[PDB]
Design a protein around this ligand. Structure first.
Ligand SMILES: [K+]
Ligand SMILES: [K+]
Ligand SMILES: [K+]
Ligand SMILES: [Mg+2]
Ligand SMILES: [Mg+2]
Ligand SMILES: [Mg+2]
Ligand SMILES: [Mg+2]
Ligand SMILES: [Mg+2]
Ligand SMILES: [Mg+2]
Ligand SMILES: [Mg+2]
Length: 114
RNA sequence: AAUAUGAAUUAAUGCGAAGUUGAAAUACAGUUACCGUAGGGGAACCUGCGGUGGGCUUAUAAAUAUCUUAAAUAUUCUUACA
């Protein structure tokens, strides 16, 4: 059915987020999912959102909150810069270690009631 | 006692022409107007108290914005590729 397809659509895959797109507090990790469009689609203002992104946007990365609003605009910011922070961390090749010597969370360890 | 008539006597008002004394109202009408009420004054009107808008909704910024392969690759593409 159409409902089944919609639930699995790429737009459905992005978790609902209404966090401020302009946040001036302390940032410790990414808050919005970066959206990327290919160069061919960018030439046609196609991002896979509800409406065409304004042609003024030359970046290929954005973050958004609402597909449409009462102001008849998309709420988005044309930035994708948290990906470069992650890739620069990867280039520094420093593994993240636990200062408390806890078990690795990414391994299925056999824990006990200690 | 009622009804009708006339009535000394006396009250209110309309229209007509037509000047006079002011300039109260319509614009922020030159003191916002009007409602109720009270007092005062040649005349409109003036003043006090509250009410109404049938006057002020007539309302319109203390400005400041961001990084990924610009192309041998996107931009071309005509039912083709798959
Ligand atoms: K007056
Ligand atoms: K009055
Ligand atoms: K009065
Ligand atoms: Mg006067
Ligand atoms: Mg006058
Ligand atoms: Mg006046
Ligand atoms: Mg007086
Ligand atoms: Mg008054
Ligand atoms: Mg008036
Ligand atoms: Mg008015």
């Amino acid at each position: 059915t159409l409902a089944e397809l919609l639930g699995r659509s790429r737009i459905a895959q992005v978790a609902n987020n209404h966090k401020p797109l302009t946040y001036t507090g302390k940032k410790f990790h990414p808050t919005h999912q970066i959206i990327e469009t290919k160069p061919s689609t960018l030439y046609r203002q196609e991002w896979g959102l509800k409406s065409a992104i304004p042609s003024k946007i030359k970046s290929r990365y954005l973050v958004y909150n609402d597909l449409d609003t009462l102001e008849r605009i998309t709420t988005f910011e044309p930035r994708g810069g948290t990906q470069w922070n992650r890739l620069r961390f990867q280039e520094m090749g420093v593994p993240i270690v636990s200062n408390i010597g806890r078990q690795n969370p990414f391994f299925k360890y056999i824990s006990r009631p200690e």
